[PDB]
Amino acid sequence: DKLAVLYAEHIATLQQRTRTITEREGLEGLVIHSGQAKRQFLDDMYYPFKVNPQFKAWLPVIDNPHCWIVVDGASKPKLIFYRPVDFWHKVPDEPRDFWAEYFDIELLVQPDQVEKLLPYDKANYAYIGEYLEVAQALGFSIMNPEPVMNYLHFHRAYKTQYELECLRQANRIAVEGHKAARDTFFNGGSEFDIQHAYLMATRQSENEMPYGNIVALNENCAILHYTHFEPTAPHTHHSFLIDAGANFNGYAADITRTYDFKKSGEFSDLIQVMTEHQIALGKALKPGLLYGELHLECHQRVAQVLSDFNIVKLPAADIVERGITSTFFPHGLGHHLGLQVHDMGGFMADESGTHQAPPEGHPFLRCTRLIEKNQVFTIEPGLYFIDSLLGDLAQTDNKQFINWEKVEEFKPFGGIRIEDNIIVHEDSLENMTRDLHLD
Amino acid sequence: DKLAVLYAEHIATLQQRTRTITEREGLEGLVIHSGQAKRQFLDDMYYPFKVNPQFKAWLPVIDNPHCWIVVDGASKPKLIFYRPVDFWHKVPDEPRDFWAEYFDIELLVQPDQVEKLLPYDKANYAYIGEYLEVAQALGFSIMNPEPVMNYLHFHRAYKTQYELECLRQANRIAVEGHKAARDTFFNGGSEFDIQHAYLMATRQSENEMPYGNIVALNENCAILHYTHFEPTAPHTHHSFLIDAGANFNGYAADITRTYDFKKSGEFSDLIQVMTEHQIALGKALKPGLLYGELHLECHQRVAQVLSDFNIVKLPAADIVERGITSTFFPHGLGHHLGLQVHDMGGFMADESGTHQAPPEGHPFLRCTRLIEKNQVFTIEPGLYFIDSLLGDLAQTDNKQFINWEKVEEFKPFGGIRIEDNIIVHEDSLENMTRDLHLD
Amino acid sequence: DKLAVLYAEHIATLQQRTRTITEREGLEGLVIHSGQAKRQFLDDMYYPFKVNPQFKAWLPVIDNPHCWIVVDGASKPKLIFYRPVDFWHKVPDEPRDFWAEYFDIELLVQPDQVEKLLPYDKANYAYIGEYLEVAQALGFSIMNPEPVMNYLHFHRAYKTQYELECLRQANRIAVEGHKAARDTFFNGGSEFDIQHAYLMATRQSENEMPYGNIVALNENCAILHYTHFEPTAPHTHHSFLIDAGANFNGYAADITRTYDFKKSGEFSDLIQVMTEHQIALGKALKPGLLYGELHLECHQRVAQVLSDFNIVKLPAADIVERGITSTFFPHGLGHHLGLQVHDMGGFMADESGTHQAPPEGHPFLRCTRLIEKNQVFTIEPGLYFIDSLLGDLAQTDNKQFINWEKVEEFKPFGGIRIEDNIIVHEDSLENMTRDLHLD
Amino acid sequence: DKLAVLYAEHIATLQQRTRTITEREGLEGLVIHSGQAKRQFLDDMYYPFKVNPQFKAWLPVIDNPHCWIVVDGASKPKLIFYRPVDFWHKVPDEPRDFWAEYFDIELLVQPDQVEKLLPYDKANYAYIGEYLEVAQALGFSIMNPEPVMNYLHFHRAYKTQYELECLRQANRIAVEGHKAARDTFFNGGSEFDIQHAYLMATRQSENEMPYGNIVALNENCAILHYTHFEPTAPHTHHSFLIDAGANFNGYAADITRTYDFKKSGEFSDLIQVMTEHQIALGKALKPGLLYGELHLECHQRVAQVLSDFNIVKLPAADIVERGITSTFFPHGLGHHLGLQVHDMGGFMADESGTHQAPPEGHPFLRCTRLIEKNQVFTIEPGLYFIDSLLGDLAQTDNKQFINWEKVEEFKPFGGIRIEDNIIVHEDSLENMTRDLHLD
Numbered sequence A, B, C, D: 001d002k003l004a005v006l007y008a009e010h011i012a013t014l015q016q017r018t019r020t021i022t023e024r025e026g027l028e029g030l031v032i033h034s035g036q037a038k039r040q041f042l043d044d045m046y047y048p049f050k051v052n053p054q055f056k057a058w059l060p061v062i063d064n065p066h067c068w069i070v071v072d073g074a075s076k077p078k079l080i081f082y083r084p085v086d087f088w089h090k091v092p093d094e095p096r097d098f099w100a101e102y103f104d105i106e107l108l109v110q111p112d113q114v115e116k117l118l119p120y121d122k123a124n125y126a127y128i129g130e131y132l133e134v135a136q137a138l139g140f141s142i143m144n145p146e147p148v149m150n151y152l153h154f155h156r157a158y159k160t161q162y163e164l165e166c167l168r169q170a171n172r173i174a175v176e177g178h179k180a181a182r183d184t185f186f187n188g189g190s191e192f193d194i195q196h197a198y199l200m201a202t203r204q205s206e207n208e209m210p211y212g213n214i215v216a217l218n219e220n221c222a223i224l225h226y227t228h229f230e231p232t233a234p235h236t237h238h239s240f241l242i243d244a245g246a247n248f249n250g251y252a253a254d255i256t257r258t259y260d261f262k263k264s265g266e267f268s269d270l271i272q273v274m275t276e277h278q279i280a281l282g283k284a285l286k287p288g289l290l291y292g293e294l295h296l297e298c299h300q301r302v303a304q305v306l307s308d309f310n311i312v313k314l315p316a317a318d319i320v321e322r323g324i325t326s327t328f329f330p331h332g333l334g335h336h337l338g339l340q341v342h343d344m345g346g347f348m349a350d351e352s353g354t355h356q357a358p359p360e361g362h363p364f365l366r367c368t369r370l371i372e373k374n375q376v377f378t379i380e381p382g383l384y385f386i387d388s389l390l391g392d393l394a395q396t397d398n399k400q401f402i403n404w405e406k407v408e409e410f411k412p413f414g415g416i417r418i419e420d421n422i423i424v425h426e427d428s429l430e431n432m433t434r435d436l437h438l439d
């Protein structure tokens, strides 16, 4: 109904985008491959299927390989839809969903008989997909050409109204998970118990999550890419960090929340100050401003928190210029969000694919691109107590400046990250995460 | 300590098998590659890791890519063990578990720094792994030679005592899952709720499962490769079929049970009668018998049930000779079980790789090989009410013989399968599943 | 094959222990004598053969005298095997059991032709055996020296996985006995019929039993060391108490069960709660705990049962404080079990041999030693109505605290003992008896 | 009542025998020790009690150690009777049996205090017992003096009218036993099953048996000291050799029978012929004939059977001269029987102890002594096909003579032995075995 309608402009929007770049590069159209299931070595099991982002761009079909889109930006889009008819599979209906009518559908019953339903002459058609050799075998010659990719990847930054609804919906699901996650941390459950409380509340499986959820207690908070889910709970609960999203129609939420168990004490106050910095950095988004500048203001804000709590025995500004903040805040402030979690385009200046330079002493910044309307961002300010980095700084001459007596008090809490998913409109911001009553 | 003691003899066995086939095929040794992480197309997210079965045949390291085993059956096996030390990950400990003692362990910090740690001259070493291009770049020319793969796959039928213990231990975990899934069925939970109770009880995540679990309610029970998990319950609970295992040290369990929701009933009775055949089929495993024959026996048994219950209006003997049983029982009785769920060597007559022909009527049978001691099997007799297969039979000259009214009564219950994991001993059968008092 | 595989580590372990103690005490090795058959005074009949425990420690040859072991913990163990070849006995083919390969076996034809095969200079060998006058005669000087006996007896508490499997296997057999014995009790069989049913089911003779079975009906249950087997049944069957085990490869089961003839009654109730105390006392075994204390914990469990059943008219705590419990429960809770029923090392705190003080309440205790993993225990809590012991309590201060009217009610039923055999693991207890599903 | 009256003559008959030898050797009397329970090496378990034959020659007390008889052959004998009073054993009744009134009974409650109930001056008393060390401690100087031993042993050959009833009561029991044994053989029971049917029917334990029953099937029959009891039955049933007795009041039976499973064939005929010969040997007992000759007569009969059946080509008498009957009949013909199975005196010429010479050909014989009245005997004529002896025969110049094709047809049946317990009278014979109609 609501989403169904917003889709019509989605198509038109893409249809145009296709026309522009097809006709510009001398192509008669694109052929976009959802992809294939990957078989495990020597085995008859498969890896969980992951759809070509460039395919699901067009429609919410994320769970079906051997699917093909042919589009030129002029003719109605033709879709080749894998619907096999074996007795061991639930024979699903012919596509009668909202997106169906917007495509010329042909049913493919066996993955090898595609070679007939694709254009006879594939000399001016671009294959957009992973399986290069499977392409060649079919007749294709042009395969993922950089101008088409660079161009398509630039305009992915600009979401249609359909996309923006999808992302809103993804956050709604995620937020529900986060509440169930939070509640089981206060009951004293294990990492494993929490992860499965989240999945339970989202009503999504481990493999539907758009990224592997990070569910950390105590020290594990500090570990940024903490994958493991400890089945037994710790002897004592101090801190809980969860970074977990959800899927809707190919679009990802991405929400991080840190919690103190005692709701009081130095760590409790540390999160609340960081929250203040987060929300502020959340509102600082506006078109015209380069994303890199918010990243510089984040280091400024952390430096302040490090000064005020006497983790570092220096004024805010001296902490920044010395390069100390990077030990406690080693990662980007955030990134574009959408079909892919770390979404495409966030480094680009123009549709050619030209790189937008990163600032000051942060040459690895994820998202540096000029903020515009219809762009969706993450805001992930972090403050961590990581041993390997604290160890590296201990060797460095800055060692004298660090209050190690304070650091050691915090190590059992691990660290903090707070992440929201923000839409930038023309004269307003839509904090999708905070608009849904998640503290 | 028990597992540890069995493991010395595991190494001795594999060293001997390795010495036999390397000598036999003119090889100086062989190099077994754990595998790599697969990056998703155009993305920075990866697929879940899946260790090379040939790698995990040696030791229970299933979570670690960029690991290499160099082995000739005479020298102490060399283990190149991936252990990166980055600040965003929890530093893993140097391998110190029971198996470490049995390998000369060198640590590998960067995957591409492996060049220096493999044999200088890879002339007569066979690479065993998925990643052929990498093998070539490193200088290997022999890769997965059929003679070696066939030999190893043949002898994988004969479990060491180490392996049988692993498999036992796997069953033990899976049963905890089965118990919890059953209880939540009888409390009127959804397919999803059930699945997540299984995960909760076994304390293993979705991707730790040896295979995608099948959690079906009522009508989904007839769908053999049912993968979906309905978040919402059906309105009325009739039947529940769960086929789900567990991992221990790289060895799978593989258990199916069917339940009726009501205490009693027609389907209730069909379950227990089917259960009676499954036990008897389980007991009919005896060395020097061709598995194929038990499959034939299964068809006889399934016929008797179809006759007795008045689903088909013929005597059991007519039902087999008319071909009717296939419609209700279309798959194999079972398979070898081990490192792989459909384990290697199961179609083999000898260690060259030569096929053992299956029975005339069912030429698509999995397990055809001569039963022997120290082999582990499944026994999955089934009776399903499958639409596409029933339709097909309504077209044939057997339509008159089917009680379509009684077939319609059962359709809401879907189908039945009951699967156990049995080790075959010299003068006894150990039914790992039933020893654990699951019912 | 399972036990065969475990044996390897067994030999290793014993070798290590031998080498440790033989070096420590300046011994070049030790000689371990199986024993001899004892002739009956003035007769040409012999007593039944009872192999030296120190001999069977190494291998399961328990029915052969004139066998010798020479070991230093380093060189391959020598076995002098007695193999007489006269027409009047069945000459079995040379040793080819799973243990053969581990020994340099030299055949002995005549027991007095052994001096040829033993070390010429016996100065630094210790003789371990009973037959001292034979030791001296062959040239031995050191015999059963305390330093060595003590060491071997201390580490006998730590069972190899082989030894644990042996002990499980003995329980398997014993349990078959207890079922048959229980059954013929309920069929109104005599003590003699029960015994012979036990032997019939265990498929072991009287002389193969690791101890003289206790098989007691009615009032005989009150007699702790009841060796008689009354051939005619009593007039009424009230109670039955069987303490009986089995042999496997030289290791002992030691199970006790008591039953009421009617399933109902007060005595019946008493069994049920004694059972519940016995189970709990079973689960209370833990590494880092003096068995001593578990003995006391029993006493207060016993008192509570006497309180709850109007046998003693005091609150639990005072009952144990007076010394009332020791009349109804006049023996130890249990003992180490292994090669010997009351296995060695039970009361030592160190491998020197020095004692482990019993609690202040009782200085009679068999087993006082600090519990650890890979140690096997009996839990024999009991409550009896012995006249003699009740007669002494009549002649003391606490005489007017007892319910003589209630005691006479129980005296037809004799008493209760409930004995299990439990292996202590690191983070679990394995109750061998109850794992086999004898109630 | 019946044997209660024959006891007084028994006592008296001994009182004389004593007086005679005590007077003659100049001793004030004898002290006869029942014995002691032997402790197992390093253990708290004991061997089963075996009573001093000399102690049980007076009365039937076979179950009780630490009993002492003081007897001079003049006064009424004294009996120290072990009667402990502890809470772990049944306290039995003060002797009130048919022998108690003939002894001045003194009660012993603790073995340690026996040197106070015995004579002050032990200088002129002989200790008769096994425990030479315990004697010295008590003060005895004379121990087991040969003149006395030889005398009592000589006269043991002459049974009192009491002793002859006892051995009649033992034979009654054994034969019930033997019937069960035969029945379960035909029913296809194992050696173990047969043995326990025997013990069940006799209502006596293994250790109550006067000797180790020999229960042999098939090829085991050829084995003379076959002690094993095979728990599983053999493939096919052919033959069955049992040699098992019983006990009454310290007096042994000793009966052997052989059977054929088919009641027809050549082996069935060989038994039948051998049992005629056996009965004819059992009738050829006459006072005044030296047993030595019966053996020779025996050897000449077996010879006949070896010529009749084509085992040996030669005629009866040549067989005997060539010495070849010692290959098929290599043991004695029989022996005196009483308190001990191979009873005392059977090699003695007179009461001094001088040995009666055995027949020239066979110095290796038990019984050589002249047959007289009141002397009980065994006749064990045997024919066996023993590989050991038949190997010694084929490597001599008598190979040619025997029929090797024929022996190989009998080897499956092993051998034959038939044994009866006969009282020799003045003008009659009393075959106690066959008088109770066992065939």
Ligand SMILES: [Mn+2]
Pocket: A243, A244, A254, A255, A256, A419
């Ligand atoms: Mn995130």
Ligand SMILES: [Mn+2]
Pocket: A254, A334, A335, A378, A380, A419
């Ligand atoms: Mn993010």
Ligand SMILES: [Mn+2]
Pocket: B254, B334, B335, B378, B380, B419
């Ligand atoms: Mn299966």
Ligand SMILES: [Mn+2]
Pocket: B243, B244, B254, B255, B256, B380, B419
């Ligand atoms: Mn399965």
Ligand SMILES: [Mn+2]
Pocket: C254, C334, C335, C378, C380, C419
């Ligand atoms: Mn015990």
Ligand SMILES: [Mn+2]
Pocket: C243, C244, C254, C255, C256, C380, C419
């Ligand atoms: Mn016991």
Ligand SMILES: [Mn+2]
Pocket: D243, D244, D254, D255, D256, D419
């Ligand atoms: Mn005999």
Ligand SMILES: [Mn+2]
Pocket: D254, D334, D335, D378, D380, D419
């Ligand atoms: Mn005899």
